[PDB]
């Protein structure tokens, strides 16, 4: 059921507050930090943008918030309510799931409903020939793949394994990673494995077995949703691999607490890359001081109370600052359109009743409002945010920490306690060690990043 | 722009690639001769025969609402919105042709439980009934073509092979399934190139250079691109580089891709669905008169294209489809069967809850899609229309809305025409004596291995 916040001009959201079901179940369990924090983030951004008279004077933004269940088909079926009128929705805050965002932009384009999506970093949405009405407040995953290849070069690792979830995040992020490895990336793919959308019979244990077959490929660079992270790390724990692999987490891993809660033994040293973030103090105070389960404006709030305390009726998530950035972007765009179509008329002027995606798309694209925490918010021609990233490591003694920053500069800090939890001085994956005495050809195979050492024995030295 | 709408009375919508995919502009291209107009006229002929049939829906006349997809999924969705704008109520949408268009339209239609019988959607991704619970299919999945293709590459000992795909479902799933099979049969995939949905002309020559980077892999297996009939038309390049192409369902028994480009020389191996030409449709199509055929809007543009005369001017109506030669498109059957299947489903429903009268009693007309598909369309079982007298072929559906796997293997041949080499039906059979490669007369049988065999 939707939240259905009444307003003069009503927005929409595609927040995945519930996780994916199994064995044909329509929906799964609440994702807590991943979903609720984002949903409430918007429900705070809108509230504050309705309280502030400096933006949209006497105009209140509505919200038909609906769960996408992190499932693509259910997301489409729930998003159908936005365009049920062939009460109009002005803009849809797209879903974190990249495939969900892809399909919802494939459908909302037909009805000219603009989208500003937090997360959903898949590069396939960059094609304006198919997703012109789609836009992003986060950097694309192409820059993330390039940053990962750079980070791998800076760590001087080689012969990396990679694991990708089926869909448009994993397969289309790992493909860009493999391409930018071949493109003078100095790194060669050891083994690529695809986690299916519906893992069965403990598939993650055979994922771990496969990855251990290339035992030398100790660096596992991973493009999978947090459920797949949770299960692949639990499977690695079950195989007594703790301290063996070094994980490199894409932004699906980020600094989320669910991939690492009660699982710190294997996740230690897991270097991760996230878009540059600041902890938004206002939302933290609003959510902390909330006398929650007492004021019940939204629906799914009771499930959060029941699951966060295991009874019958913290740190904020990474993306929420992009959620509120997206909402603020929407609002600001609408404000500009108003000031360009009916200046001086406070309230909902008649021109804002038939709001159309075609005109609002330009104002969405060129909007600039310096963000909630001073990060500039702007969109290029394709509607993507500028590529800047923070580089994290999971260092114990929930204890993530900054170790560098990547924006075209590879600004790492190795002395910033960068050791991946074992040994000393950044232990390395490498396919074949150097052979100083000298080798008849140090013969490389067809993959150029690794060699067989045949020594200069005998008179051939 | 134009839409083909016949009379009412429970119309069946249809998606056909009547026009070619256009360039960078927001417009369609030329008229697709074989893969396009012929399938549309076949479904129209099937509807006419069904209406004429005294047994199939005697009291119900089947209309049509035919749309043009232009081989673009985006335009396909923008057009197929007319199907859901009814909630005249379209009973079901037949077709989708290219599997990405079919996937997009099925995703749109599952919100309105519109049954979709596709005549050419082959990609294995449409086999998942969790996402496509209202999808039926008269063709086998492409997984089986990855079987046949592997068998072929194992018969000529082609251990080294290069894969070319296109972005979208067909290419992705085809190369994934063939790579799985190749690893299952010790066959090594040298390289895996992909072409984007509308990638440039020069980048196709770049992809051919990448293919040539591995000189050992003389055999370059082709996964249809979007459709070899018009995308490999831009990638069968004759920059003095030759191969032994092995080609999927997008290449076979049509000259649209091989015209003017003999770089894909005689002997290129293609796989097409196993089918027979229906006899009466040849007469129907050849006898068809452009000024009498006021039904089809695109037919007049097709006859402006085939014969360069514009019907707005003279030098037209002098030629005819009887004088010029006619070859029936391979999938024409897979179209007509689909239409008949839907008709029979409707007839079964009329036998079920409307037996007391000739036509609909107005309670079924808001046709419930879910019961229709699950109980009637999925349970159709009848022999194919207009079979050759010998065969007993029938067009029942699988447990998950798919057909039976049977393929014919062709090779391009000079004195220039295609030629059926053999067939795959749960086992490969090649009568190699029928192709120039057996009894090697141009050097030995073409070889593709990573390294040469060595002595004791
Ligand atoms: N793999 C997703 C993760 C979204 C999320 O953090 O919820 C990106 O894009
Ligand atoms: N499924 C093929 C097209 C087959 C056909 O239309 O003949 C691609 O996509």
From Swiss-Prot, chain A:
Gene, per the UniProt record: GRM4
Main localization category: membrane
Protein name, entry field: Metabotropic glutamate receptor 4
Family statement: Belongs to the G-protein coupled receptor 3 family.
All ranges on the Extracellular side of the membrane: 1-461
A GO biological process held by the record: G protein-coupled glutamate receptor signaling pathway
Expressed in which tissues: Strongly expressed in the cerebellum. Expressed at low levels in hippocampus, hypothalamus and thalamus. No expression detected in liver.
Glycosylation sites: 58, 240, 368
GO cellular component: cytoplasmic vesicle; plasma membrane; presynapse
GO molecular function, one term: adenylate cyclase inhibiting G protein-coupled glutamate receptor activity
Binding site for L-glutamate: 98, 119-121, 169, 251, 319
Organism: Homo sapiens
Keyword Transmembrane applies: yes
Keywords on record: Cell membrane, Disulfide bond, G-protein coupled receptor, Glycoprotein, Membrane, Receptor, Signal, Transducer, Transmembrane, Transmembrane helix
Subunit structure, interactors included: Interacts with PICK1.
Membrane-topology descriptor: Multi-pass membrane protein
Cysteines paired by S-S bonds: 27-69, 188-449, 342-349, 431-450, 435-453
Annotated function: G-protein coupled receptor for glutamate. Ligand binding causes a conformation change that triggers signaling via guanine nucleotide-binding proteins (G proteins) and modulates the activity of down-stream effectors. Signaling inhibits adenylate cyclase activity.
Subcellular location: Cell membrane
Swiss-Prot record, chain B:
Entry keywords, A to Z: Cell membrane, Cell projection, Disulfide bond, G-protein coupled receptor, Glycoprotein, Membrane, Receptor, Signal, Synapse, Transducer, Transmembrane, Transmembrane helix
UniProt main location, coarse: membrane
Residues at which L-glutamate binds: 35, 39, 99, 120, 122, 249, 331
Extracellular membrane side: 1-456
GO biological process, one term: long-term synaptic depression
Disulfide bonds: 28-70, 309-316, 354-361
Tissue: Detected in brain cortex (at protein level). Widely expressed in different regions of the adult brain as well as in fetal brain.
Annotated GO MF terms: calcium channel regulator activity; G protein-coupled receptor activity; glutamate receptor activity; group II metabotropic glutamate receptor activity; scaffold protein binding
Task of the protein: Dimeric G protein-coupled receptor which is activated by the excitatory neurotransmitter L-glutamate. Plays critical roles in modulating synaptic transmission and neuronal excitability. Upon activation by glutamate, inhibits presynaptic calcium channels, reducing further glutamate release and dampening excitatory signaling. Mechanistically, ligand binding causes a conformation change that triggers signaling via guanine nucleotide-binding proteins (G proteins) and modulates the activity of down-stream effectors, such as adenylate cyclase.
Subunit field text: Forms heterodimers with GRM3 or GRM4. Interacts with TAMALIN. Interacts with HTR2A.
Family statement: Belongs to the G-protein coupled receptor 3 family.
Annotated protein name in UniProt: Metabotropic glutamate receptor 2
Species, as recorded: Homo sapiens (Human)
């Amino acid at each position: 059921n939707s939240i259905r916040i009444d307003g003069d001009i009503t927005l929409g959201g595609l927040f995945p507050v519930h996780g994916r079901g199994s064995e044909g179940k329509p929906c799964g369990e609440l994702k807590k930090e991943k979903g609720i924090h984002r949903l409430e983030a918007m429900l705070f951004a809108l509230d504050r943008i309705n309280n502030d008279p400096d933006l949209l004077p006497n105009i209140t933004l509505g919200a038909r918030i609906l769960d996408t269940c992190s499932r693509d088909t259910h997301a489409l079926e729930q998003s159908l309510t936005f365009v049920q009128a062939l009460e109009r929705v002005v803009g849809v805050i797209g879903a974190s799931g990249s495939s969900v965002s892809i399909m919802v932009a494939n459908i909302l384009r037909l009805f000219k409903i603009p989208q500003i999506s937090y997360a959903s970093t898949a590069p396939d949405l960059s094609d304006n020939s198919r997703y012109d009405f789609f836009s992003r407040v986060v950097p694309s995953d192409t820059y993330q793949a390039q940053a990962m290849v750079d980070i791998v070069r800076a760590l001087k690792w080689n012969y990396v394994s990679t694991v990708a979830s089926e869909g448009s995040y994993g397969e289309s992020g790992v493909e860009a990673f493999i391409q930018k490895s071949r493109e003078d990336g100095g790194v060669c793919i050891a083994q690529s494995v695809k986690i299916p959308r519906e893992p069965k019979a403990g598939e993650f244990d055979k994922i771990i077995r496969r990855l251990l077959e290339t035992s030398n490929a100790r660096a596992v660079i991973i493009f999978a949703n947090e459920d797949d992270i949770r299960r692949v790390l639990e499977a690695a724990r079950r195989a007594n691999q703790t301290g063996h692999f070094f994980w490199m987490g894409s932004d699906s891993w980020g600094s989320k607490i669910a991939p690492v809660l009660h699982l710190e033994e294997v996740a230690e040293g897991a270097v991760t890359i996230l878009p540059k973030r600041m902890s938004v103090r206002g939302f933290d105070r609003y959510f902390s001081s909330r006398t929650l389960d007492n004021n019940r404006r939204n629906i799914w709030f009771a499930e959060f109370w029941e699951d966060n305390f295991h009874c019958k009726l913290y740190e904020q998530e990474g993306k929420v600052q992009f959620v509120i950035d997206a909402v603020y972007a929407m609002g600001h765009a609408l404000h500009a359109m108003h000031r360009d179509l009916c200046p001086g008329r406070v309230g909902l002027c008649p021109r804002m009743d038939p709001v159309d995606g075609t005109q609002l798309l330009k104002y969405i694209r060129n909007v600039n409002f310096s963000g909630i925490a001073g990060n500039p918010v702007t969109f290029n021609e394709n509607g993507d945010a500028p590529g800047r990233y923070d580089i994290y490591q999971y260092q114990l003694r929930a204890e993530y920490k900054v170790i560098g920053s990547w924006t075209d500069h590879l600004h790492l800090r190795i002395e910033r306690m960068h050791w991946p939890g074992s040994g000393q001085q950044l232990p390395r994956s490498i396919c074949s060690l150097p052979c100083q005495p000298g080798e008849r050809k140090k013969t490389v195979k067809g993959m150029p990043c690794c060699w067989h050492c045949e020594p200069c024995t005998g008179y051939q030295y | 722009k134009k839409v083909l709408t016949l009379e009412g009375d429970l119309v069946l919508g249809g998606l056909f690639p009547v026009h070619q995919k256009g360039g960078p502009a927001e417009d369609c291209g030329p008229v697709n001769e074989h893969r396009g107009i012929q399938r549309l006229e076949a479904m129209l002929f099937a509807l006419d025969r069904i209406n004429r049939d005294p047994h199939l829906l005697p009291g119900v006349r089947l209309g049509a609402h035919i749309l043009d997809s232009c081989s673009k999924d985006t335009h396909a969705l923008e057009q197929a919105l007319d199907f859901v704008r009814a909630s005249t109520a379209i009973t079901g949408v037949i077709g989708g042709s290219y599997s990405d268009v079919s996937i997009q339209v099925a995703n749109l239609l599952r919100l309105f439980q519109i049954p979709q019988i596709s005549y050419a959607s082959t990609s294995a991704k449409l086999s998942d009934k969790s996402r496509y619970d209202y999808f039926a299919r008269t063709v086998p999945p492409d997984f089986f073509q990855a079987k046949a293709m592997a068998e072929i590459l194992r018969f000529f000992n082609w251990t080294y092979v290069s894969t070319v795909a296109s972005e979208g479902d067909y290419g992705e799933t085809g190369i994934e399934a063939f790579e799985l099979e190749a690893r299952a049969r010790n066959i090594c995939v040298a390289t895996s190139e992909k072409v984007g949905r509308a990638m440039s002309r020069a980048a196709f020559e770049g992809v051919v250079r990448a293919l040539l980077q591995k000189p050992s892999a003389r055999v370059a297996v082709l996964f249809t691109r979007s459709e070899d009939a018009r995308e490999l038309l831009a990638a069968s390049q004759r920059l003095n580089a030759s191969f032994t192409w092995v080609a999927s369902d997008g290449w076979g028994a049509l000259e649209s891709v091989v015209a003017g480009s003999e770089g894909a020389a005689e002997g290129a191996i293609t796989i097409e669905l196993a089918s027979y030409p229906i006899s009466d449709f040849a007469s129907y199509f050849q006898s068809l008169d452009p000024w009498n055929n006021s039904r089809n809007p695109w037919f007049r543009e097709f006859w402006e294209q085939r014969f360069r005369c514009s019907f707005r001017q003279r030098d037209c109506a002098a030629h005819s489809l009887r004088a010029v030669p006619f070859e029936q498109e391979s999938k024409i059957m897979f179209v007509v069967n689909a239409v008949y299947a839907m008709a029979h489903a409707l007839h079964n429903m009329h036998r079920a809850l409307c037996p007391n009268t000739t036509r609909l009693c107005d309670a079924m007309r808001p046709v419930n899609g879910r019961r229709l598909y699950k109980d009637f369309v999925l349970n159709v079982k009848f022999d194919a229309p207009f079979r050759p007298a010998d065969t007993h072929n029938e067009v029942r559906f699988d447990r998950f809305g798919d057909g039976i796997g049977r393929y014919n293997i062709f090779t391009y041949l000079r004195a220039y025409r295609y030629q059926k080499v053999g067939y795959w039906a749960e086992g490969l059979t090649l009568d190699t004596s029928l192709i120039p490669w057996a009894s090697p007369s141009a050097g030995p049988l073409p070889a593709s291995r990573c390294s040469e065999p060595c002595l004791q």
